Amino acid sequence: LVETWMKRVSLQKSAAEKCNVYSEAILKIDPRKVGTPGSFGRLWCSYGDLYWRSNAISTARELWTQSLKVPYPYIEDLEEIYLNWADRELDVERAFSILEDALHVPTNPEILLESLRIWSKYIDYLEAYIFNKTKMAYNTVIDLRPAMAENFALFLQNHVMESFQVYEKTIPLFPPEIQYELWIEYLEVATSHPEHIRFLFEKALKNLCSNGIDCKTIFIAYSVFEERISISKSIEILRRGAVILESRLQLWRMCISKAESTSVTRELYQECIQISKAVEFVIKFSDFESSITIRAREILAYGAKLNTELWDSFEIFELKXXXXXXXXXXXXXXXXXX
Amino acid sequence: VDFEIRQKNWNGVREIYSKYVMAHPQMQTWLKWVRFENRHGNTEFTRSVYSLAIDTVANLQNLQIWSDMEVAKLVNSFAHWEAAQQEYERSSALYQIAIEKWPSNQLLKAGLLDFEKQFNSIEETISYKRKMEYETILSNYDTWWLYLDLISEFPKQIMQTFEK
Numbered sequence: 051l052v053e054t055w056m057k058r059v060s061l062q063k064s065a066a067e068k069c070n071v072y073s074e075a076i077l078k079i080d081p082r083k084v085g086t087p088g089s090f091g092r093l094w095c096s097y098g099d100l101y102w103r104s105n106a107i108s109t110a111r112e113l114w115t116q117s118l119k120v121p122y123p124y125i126e127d128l129e130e131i132y133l134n135w136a137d138r139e140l141d142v143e144r145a146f147s148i149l150e151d152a153l154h155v156p157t158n159p160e161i162l163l164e165s166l167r168i169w170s171k172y173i174d175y176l177e178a179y180i181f182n183k184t185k186m187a188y189n190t191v192i193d194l195r196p197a198m199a200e201n202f203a204l205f206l207q208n209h210v211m212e213s214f215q216v217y218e219k220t221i222p223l224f225p226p227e228i229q230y231e232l233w234i235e236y237l238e239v240a241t242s243h244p245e246h247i248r249f250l251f252e253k254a255l256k257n258l259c260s261n262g263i264d265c266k267t268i269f270i271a272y273s274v275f276e277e278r279i280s281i282s283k284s285i286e287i288l289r290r291g292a293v294i295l296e297s298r299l300q301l302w303r304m305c306i307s308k309a310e311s312t313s314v315t316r317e318l319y320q321e322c323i324q325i326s327k328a329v330e331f332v333i334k335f336s337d338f339e340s341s342i343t344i345r346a347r348e349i350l351a352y353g354a355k356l357n358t359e360l361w362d363s364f365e366i367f368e369l370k371x372x373x374x375x376x377x378x379x380x381x382x383x384x385x386x387x388x
Numbered sequence: 389v390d391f392e393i394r395q396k397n398w399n400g401v402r403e404i405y406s407k408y409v410m411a412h413p414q415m416q417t418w419l420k421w422v423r424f425e426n427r428h429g430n431t432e433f434t435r436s437v438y439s440l441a442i443d444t445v446a447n448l449q450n451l452q453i454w455s456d457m458e459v460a461k462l463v464n465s466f467a468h469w470e471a472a473q474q475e476y477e478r479s480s481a482l483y484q485i486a487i488e489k490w491p492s493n494q495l496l497k498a499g500l501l502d503f504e505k506q507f508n509s510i511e512e513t514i515s516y517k518r519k520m521e522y523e524t525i526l527s528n529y530d531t532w533w534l535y536l537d538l539i540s541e542f543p544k545q546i547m548q549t550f551e552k
Binding site: 214218221245246249252283 | 516520532
């Protein structure tokens with residue numbers, strides 16, 4: 051593989067001499083260019099580049115020769131020649147021609163199977179270059195299989211119906227990094243503007259329960275969405291989502307946030323507290339009690355019973371009483387004993 | 389089956405699958421069989437198997453098998469197989485047939501709704517939302533339910549159920 055390119059390198063000092071070596075060696079059979087390289091090898095491509103440096107029509111024709119020279123069991127061999135022929139063509143009718151070529155490739159590669167990088171390139175071409183065709187490519191690409199791009203383009207040129215079916219596409223792309231997709235779609239769906247949306251959100255939630263990643267975020271999205279629509283039962287929805295280990299920790303913090311934003315509040319506090327993190331939660335809800343003197347005190351005591359930051363909390367409570375302070379000393383002493 | 393798959397052949401296995409339904413008329417069995425046919429190259433038999441299963445379900449329609457759940461699951465699976473395949477017309481027909489042949493279509497309707505969403509929007513929001521109201525009712529956001537109904541509607545059922 052390297053020998054040929056070394057010869058070519060030598061040739062590079064002058065015009066095409068050992069470039070013609072490559073040409074000769076590769077043109078004899080597929081085994082010397084396609085078979086020599088186990089993976090993809092830019093020998094034909096190299097030749098084309100050389101010709102490009104030399105001239106334009108000759109380069110296009112040399113390149114054409116490269117295309118004709120069918121590569122081995124390898125991916126992204128003729129795509130770089132078609133890419134250097136696309137850009138070259140453009141440097142938007144010749145570029146379209148390269149896009150047509152790409153279309154053929156897509157048809158031919160898909161057909162062959164029953165090309166991914168190539169597909170991406172095609173998409174880039176059809177999107178950058180009118181809209182419906184690009185959409186078609188997107189669809190094809192999806193089938194073959196990024197959708198974020200589709201959403202973006204759709205959002206831009208068609209300005210949420212293109213991004214609604216784009217949202218559908220995301221949903222339908224049951225492939226990994228799907229939580230993010232769903233989230234993004236949700237975000238777009240609220241900003242582009244409704245009960246359908248809510249339903250979608252619910253679906254996302256129920257299905258993406260074993261994510262263990264942005265569950266708190268998801269909950270926020272839900273509760274937030276509900277709020278936008280409207281309310282306090284939606285805070286319980288968020289709470290629920292958050293209530294259902296370290297993802298759940300984050301969740302519980304979310305719950306705390308919601309609950310501080312909130313009898314019902316008391317209930318929430320009781321829940322969250324009850325559910326090491328638990329101690330912290332206790333501190334939270336104990337504080338809540340402090341806002342809500344006897345009951346609060348009791349709550350504080352309970353929290354304490356569940357280390358030295360708790361002492362501080364107790365002290366604070368005692369501010370909110372001489373007898374209470376005495377109790378604090380007592381309880382603290384007891385704690386020390388334990 | 390595993391033995392008979394570890395055995396390289398894929399005939400006689402078919403017969404035992406057929407018998408494996410005979411002993412265990414369970415939808416899980418059918419689903420497993422379908423999965424096997426998915427491993428199998430000839431897609432014709434996959435569809436054929438689906439046709440068979442559906443036919444059998446039809447024949448023993450009345451309460452003499454599995455619950456609505458299993459049948460719903462089956463219908464869903466079939467629908468998604470067809471979804472991979474060309475003929476969505478037949479899928480649609482099946483769905484209509486399914487709603488026609490089966491009452492108590494919460495599962496069935498749900499599946500149908502999902503398919504519609506995949507493959508209209510108003511309908512989806514409508515039926516799905518209504519289901520959510522039913523779900524809501526089961527929980528008790530009952531106000532939210534009634535409101536939803538009112539918005540979605542039909543309006544006679546909105547005001548009747550509102551009154552209720």
